[PDB]
Amino acid sequence: GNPLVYLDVDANGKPLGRVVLELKADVVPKTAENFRALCTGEKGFGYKGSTFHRVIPSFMCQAGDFTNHNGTGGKSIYGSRFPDENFTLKHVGPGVLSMANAGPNTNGSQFFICTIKTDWLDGKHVVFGHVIEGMDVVKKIESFGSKSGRTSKKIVITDCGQLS
């Protein structure tokens, strides 16, 4: 079936717990596979040790820039960027997992977890999974954001990987 992956997240060096994500490989196999492999680190790079660098309360928590840690970087397992696979899944509510980008066909490694329905992103960002467990952890992360996106605690993915 579809992969289950995990992110273990610290805030200011103390653990918040685990976010478990289902990746919809049946709908977006290429996008799911990229995220899966970046969680395991099996290509020699990935999310371990990187941060949630942009967090906006009542919107979303963004992460995945494991090269520049600020929203300018990241890379996929395929190359620096890869196309928008499809827009079939929608930003339906809290817990949606979707690709951040810098315009059409600029997916790399950055991603976000929504904390509300974000319908205006439908057709612009590729949705590829959702939170199975750990929305409490997501709400903690969200609470350390701000309107500007600047975080008030350092939010680190200490460990990540594949459960099934």
PDB file of C-alpha atoms in Angstrom:
ATOM      1  CA  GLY A   1       0.000   0.000   0.000  1.00  0.00           C
ATOM      2  CA  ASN A   2       0.852   3.688   0.263  1.00  0.00           C
ATOM      3  CA  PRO A   3       3.984   4.527   2.302  1.00  0.00           C
ATOM      4  CA  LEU A   4       3.807   5.667   5.908  1.00  0.00           C
ATOM      5  CA  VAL A   5       6.687   7.930   6.952  1.00  0.00           C
ATOM      6  CA  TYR A   6       7.553   9.843  10.116  1.00  0.00           C
ATOM      7  CA  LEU A   7       9.139  13.090  11.286  1.00  0.00           C
ATOM      8  CA  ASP A   8      10.373  13.386  14.892  1.00  0.00           C
ATOM      9  CA  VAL A   9      10.410  17.093  15.766  1.00  0.00           C
ATOM     10  CA  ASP A  10      12.193  19.105  18.497  1.00  0.00           C
ATOM     11  CA  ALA A  11      11.502  22.689  19.553  1.00  0.00           C
ATOM     12  CA  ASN A  12      14.494  24.417  21.164  1.00  0.00           C
ATOM     13  CA  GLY A  13      16.190  21.056  21.563  1.00  0.00           C
ATOM     14  CA  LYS A  14      13.389  19.202  23.339  1.00  0.00           C
ATOM     15  CA  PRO A  15      11.152  16.625  21.631  1.00  0.00           C
ATOM     16  CA  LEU A  16       7.562  17.436  20.714  1.00  0.00           C
ATOM     17  CA  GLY A  17       6.800  13.958  19.391  1.00  0.00           C
ATOM     18  CA  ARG A  18       6.177  12.341  16.030  1.00  0.00           C
ATOM     19  CA  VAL A  19       4.231  13.312  12.917  1.00  0.00           C
ATOM     20  CA  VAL A  20       3.177  10.302  10.818  1.00  0.00           C
ATOM     21  CA  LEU A  21       2.318  10.973   7.160  1.00  0.00           C
ATOM     22  CA  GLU A  22       0.607   8.796   4.557  1.00  0.00           C
ATOM     23  CA  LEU A  23       2.009   9.446   1.077  1.00  0.00           C
ATOM     24  CA  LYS A  24      -0.541   9.057  -1.737  1.00  0.00           C
ATOM     25  CA  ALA A  25       1.707   7.127  -4.119  1.00  0.00           C
ATOM     26  CA  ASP A  26      -1.382   5.724  -5.853  1.00  0.00           C
ATOM     27  CA  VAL A  27      -2.216   9.275  -7.040  1.00  0.00           C
ATOM     28  CA  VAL A  28       1.197  11.007  -7.188  1.00  0.00           C
ATOM     29  CA  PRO A  29       3.833   8.252  -7.277  1.00  0.00           C
ATOM     30  CA  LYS A  30       6.768  10.457  -8.309  1.00  0.00           C
ATOM     31  CA  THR A  31       6.061  13.099  -5.668  1.00  0.00           C
ATOM     32  CA  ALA A  32       5.454  10.485  -2.968  1.00  0.00           C
ATOM     33  CA  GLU A  33       8.673   8.624  -3.838  1.00  0.00           C
ATOM     34  CA  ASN A  34      10.753  11.802  -3.581  1.00  0.00           C
ATOM     35  CA  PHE A  35       9.418  12.564  -0.100  1.00  0.00           C
ATOM     36  CA  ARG A  36       9.756   8.930   1.032  1.00  0.00           C
ATOM     37  CA  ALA A  37      13.415   8.737   0.004  1.00  0.00           C
ATOM     38  CA  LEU A  38      14.202  12.128   1.567  1.00  0.00           C
ATOM     39  CA  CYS A  39      12.760  10.792   4.849  1.00  0.00           C
ATOM     40  CA  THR A  40      14.885   7.629   4.788  1.00  0.00           C
ATOM     41  CA  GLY A  41      17.972   9.512   3.594  1.00  0.00           C
ATOM     42  CA  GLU A  42      18.802   6.555   1.353  1.00  0.00           C
ATOM     43  CA  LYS A  43      20.213   8.713  -1.487  1.00  0.00           C
ATOM     44  CA  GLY A  44      22.749  10.265   0.915  1.00  0.00           C
ATOM     45  CA  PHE A  45      20.790  13.441   1.730  1.00  0.00           C
ATOM     46  CA  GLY A  46      17.366  14.356   3.049  1.00  0.00           C
ATOM     47  CA  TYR A  47      15.354  15.852   5.857  1.00  0.00           C
ATOM     48  CA  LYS A  48      17.236  14.558   8.917  1.00  0.00           C
ATOM     49  CA  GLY A  49      18.582  17.495  10.919  1.00  0.00           C
ATOM     50  CA  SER A  50      16.726  20.170   8.929  1.00  0.00           C
ATOM     51  CA  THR A  51      14.142  22.697  10.139  1.00  0.00           C
ATOM     52  CA  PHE A  52      10.635  24.095   9.875  1.00  0.00           C
ATOM     53  CA  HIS A  53      11.828  27.537   8.753  1.00  0.00           C
ATOM     54  CA  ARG A  54       8.507  29.245   7.914  1.00  0.00           C
ATOM     55  CA  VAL A  55       5.414  28.772  10.093  1.00  0.00           C
ATOM     56  CA  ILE A  56       2.267  30.922   9.912  1.00  0.00           C
ATOM     57  CA  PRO A  57      -0.464  30.351  12.525  1.00  0.00           C
ATOM     58  CA  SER A  58      -3.863  29.531  11.041  1.00  0.00           C
ATOM     59  CA  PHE A  59      -2.207  28.667   7.714  1.00  0.00           C
ATOM     60  CA  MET A  60       0.634  26.131   7.487  1.00  0.00           C
ATOM     61  CA  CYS A  61       4.017  24.853   8.674  1.00  0.00           C
ATOM     62  CA  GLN A  62       6.774  24.752   6.017  1.00  0.00           C
ATOM     63  CA  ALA A  63       9.975  22.712   6.012  1.00  0.00           C
ATOM     64  CA  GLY A  64      12.268  20.752   3.719  1.00  0.00           C
ATOM     65  CA  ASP A  65      15.041  23.213   2.841  1.00  0.00           C
ATOM     66  CA  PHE A  66      17.860  20.929   3.940  1.00  0.00           C
ATOM     67  CA  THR A  67      20.521  22.811   1.943  1.00  0.00           C
ATOM     68  CA  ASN A  68      19.996  26.508   2.855  1.00  0.00           C
ATOM     69  CA  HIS A  69      17.541  26.230   5.793  1.00  0.00           C
ATOM     70  CA  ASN A  70      15.706  29.395   4.733  1.00  0.00           C
ATOM     71  CA  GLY A  71      13.302  28.712   1.838  1.00  0.00           C
ATOM     72  CA  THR A  72      15.738  29.222  -1.043  1.00  0.00           C
ATOM     73  CA  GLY A  73      17.141  25.695  -1.282  1.00  0.00           C
ATOM     74  CA  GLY A  74      16.450  21.986  -1.261  1.00  0.00           C
ATOM     75  CA  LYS A  75      16.729  19.418  -4.031  1.00  0.00           C
ATOM     76  CA  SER A  76      14.786  16.362  -5.141  1.00  0.00           C
ATOM     77  CA  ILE A  77      16.033  12.808  -5.602  1.00  0.00           C
ATOM     78  CA  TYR A  78      15.675  13.325  -9.377  1.00  0.00           C
ATOM     79  CA  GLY A  79      17.650  16.550  -9.740  1.00  0.00           C
ATOM     80  CA  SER A  80      17.250  20.072  -8.453  1.00  0.00           C
ATOM     81  CA  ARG A  81      13.572  20.443  -9.448  1.00  0.00           C
ATOM     82  CA  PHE A  82      10.823  18.281 -10.925  1.00  0.00           C
ATOM     83  CA  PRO A  83       7.443  18.883 -12.608  1.00  0.00           C
ATOM     84  CA  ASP A  84       4.034  19.251 -11.030  1.00  0.00           C
ATOM     85  CA  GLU A  85       2.760  15.682 -11.236  1.00  0.00           C
ATOM     86  CA  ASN A  86      -0.969  16.505 -11.040  1.00  0.00           C
ATOM     87  CA  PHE A  87      -3.389  18.604  -8.996  1.00  0.00           C
ATOM     88  CA  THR A  88      -5.868  15.798  -8.328  1.00  0.00           C
ATOM     89  CA  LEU A  89      -5.758  15.947  -4.507  1.00  0.00           C
ATOM     90  CA  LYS A  90      -7.061  19.155  -2.944  1.00  0.00           C
ATOM     91  CA  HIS A  91      -6.097  21.271   0.074  1.00  0.00           C
ATOM     92  CA  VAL A  92      -9.163  20.083   1.952  1.00  0.00           C
ATOM     93  CA  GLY A  93      -8.336  20.949   5.572  1.00  0.00           C
ATOM     94  CA  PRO A  94      -5.874  20.606   8.437  1.00  0.00           C
ATOM     95  CA  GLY A  95      -3.278  17.883   8.008  1.00  0.00           C
ATOM     96  CA  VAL A  96      -2.840  18.137   4.222  1.00  0.00           C
ATOM     97  CA  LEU A  97       0.762  17.566   3.067  1.00  0.00           C
ATOM     98  CA  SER A  98       1.686  19.541  -0.061  1.00  0.00           C
ATOM     99  CA  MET A  99       4.754  20.661  -2.030  1.00  0.00           C
ATOM    100  CA  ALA A 100       6.066  24.181  -1.623  1.00  0.00           C
ATOM    101  CA  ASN A 101       7.324  25.736  -4.856  1.00  0.00           C
ATOM    102  CA  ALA A 102       8.476  28.890  -6.645  1.00  0.00           C
ATOM    103  CA  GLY A 103       5.994  28.675  -9.500  1.00  0.00           C
ATOM    104  CA  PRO A 104       4.947  25.947 -11.934  1.00  0.00           C
ATOM    105  CA  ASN A 105       7.189  22.883 -12.116  1.00  0.00           C
ATOM    106  CA  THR A 106       9.631  23.883  -9.357  1.00  0.00           C
ATOM    107  CA  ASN A 107       9.149  21.087  -6.816  1.00  0.00           C
ATOM    108  CA  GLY A 108      12.325  20.215  -4.943  1.00  0.00           C
ATOM    109  CA  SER A 109      12.215  19.125  -1.329  1.00  0.00           C
ATOM    110  CA  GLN A 110      10.292  21.879   0.462  1.00  0.00           C
ATOM    111  CA  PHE A 111       6.853  20.943   1.748  1.00  0.00           C
ATOM    112  CA  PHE A 112       4.142  22.196   4.043  1.00  0.00           C
ATOM    113  CA  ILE A 113       1.511  20.816   6.392  1.00  0.00           C
ATOM    114  CA  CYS A 114      -1.709  22.821   6.394  1.00  0.00           C
ATOM    115  CA  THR A 115      -3.482  23.746   9.621  1.00  0.00           C
ATOM    116  CA  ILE A 116      -6.665  24.908   7.827  1.00  0.00           C
ATOM    117  CA  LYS A 117      -8.339  24.402   4.453  1.00  0.00           C
ATOM    118  CA  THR A 118      -6.291  26.370   1.878  1.00  0.00           C
ATOM    119  CA  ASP A 119      -8.429  26.164  -1.256  1.00  0.00           C
ATOM    120  CA  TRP A 120      -6.588  28.928  -3.132  1.00  0.00           C
ATOM    121  CA  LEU A 121      -3.553  26.624  -3.386  1.00  0.00           C
ATOM    122  CA  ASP A 122      -5.536  24.029  -5.363  1.00  0.00           C
ATOM    123  CA  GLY A 123      -4.090  23.801  -8.865  1.00  0.00           C
ATOM    124  CA  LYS A 124      -0.863  25.533  -7.775  1.00  0.00           C
ATOM    125  CA  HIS A 125       0.698  23.147  -5.221  1.00  0.00           C
ATOM    126  CA  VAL A 126       0.833  19.362  -5.550  1.00  0.00           C
ATOM    127  CA  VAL A 127      -0.896  17.681  -2.607  1.00  0.00           C
ATOM    128  CA  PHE A 128       0.658  14.289  -1.919  1.00  0.00           C
ATOM    129  CA  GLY A 129      -0.327  13.075   1.553  1.00  0.00           C
ATOM    130  CA  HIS A 130      -1.826  13.801   4.938  1.00  0.00           C
ATOM    131  CA  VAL A 131      -1.211  13.504   8.670  1.00  0.00           C
ATOM    132  CA  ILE A 132      -2.168  10.070  10.076  1.00  0.00           C
ATOM    133  CA  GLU A 133      -0.989  10.763  13.637  1.00  0.00           C
ATOM    134  CA  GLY A 134       0.564  13.720  15.419  1.00  0.00           C
ATOM    135  CA  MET A 135      -1.685  16.665  14.690  1.00  0.00           C
ATOM    136  CA  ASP A 136      -0.944  17.668  18.298  1.00  0.00           C
ATOM    137  CA  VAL A 137       2.710  18.036  17.271  1.00  0.00           C
ATOM    138  CA  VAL A 138       1.688  20.065  14.212  1.00  0.00           C
ATOM    139  CA  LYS A 139      -0.371  22.383  16.437  1.00  0.00           C
ATOM    140  CA  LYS A 140       2.660  22.873  18.701  1.00  0.00           C
ATOM    141  CA  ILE A 141       4.832  23.758  15.678  1.00  0.00           C
ATOM    142  CA  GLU A 142       2.129  26.129  14.419  1.00  0.00           C
ATOM    143  CA  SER A 143       2.030  27.893  17.803  1.00  0.00           C
ATOM    144  CA  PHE A 144       5.726  28.795  17.394  1.00  0.00           C
ATOM    145  CA  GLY A 145       5.115  30.659  14.124  1.00  0.00           C
ATOM    146  CA  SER A 146       4.182  34.263  13.401  1.00  0.00           C
ATOM    147  CA  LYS A 147       2.406  36.338  10.766  1.00  0.00           C
ATOM    148  CA  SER A 148       5.748  36.918   9.000  1.00  0.00           C
ATOM    149  CA  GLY A 149       6.564  33.203   9.082  1.00  0.00           C
ATOM    150  CA  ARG A 150       9.524  33.670  11.434  1.00  0.00           C
ATOM    151  CA  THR A 151       9.613  30.972  14.110  1.00  0.00           C
ATOM    152  CA  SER A 152      10.000  31.863  17.794  1.00  0.00           C
ATOM    153  CA  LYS A 153      11.613  28.508  18.637  1.00  0.00           C
ATOM    154  CA  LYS A 154      14.081  26.491  16.588  1.00  0.00           C
ATOM    155  CA  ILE A 155      12.028  23.640  15.102  1.00  0.00           C
ATOM    156  CA  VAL A 156      14.203  20.697  14.014  1.00  0.00           C
ATOM    157  CA  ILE A 157      13.394  17.361  12.353  1.00  0.00           C
ATOM    158  CA  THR A 158      15.805  15.314  14.469  1.00  0.00           C
ATOM    159  CA  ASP A 159      14.921  11.947  12.915  1.00  0.00           C
ATOM    160  CA  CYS A 160      12.757  10.748  10.042  1.00  0.00           C
ATOM    161  CA  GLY A 161      12.151   7.585   8.088  1.00  0.00           C
ATOM    162  CA  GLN A 162       9.736   5.031   6.717  1.00  0.00           C
ATOM    163  CA  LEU A 163       7.347   2.926   8.819  1.00  0.00           C
ATOM    164  CA  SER A 164       5.808   0.856   5.980  1.00  0.00           C
TER     165      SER A 164
END
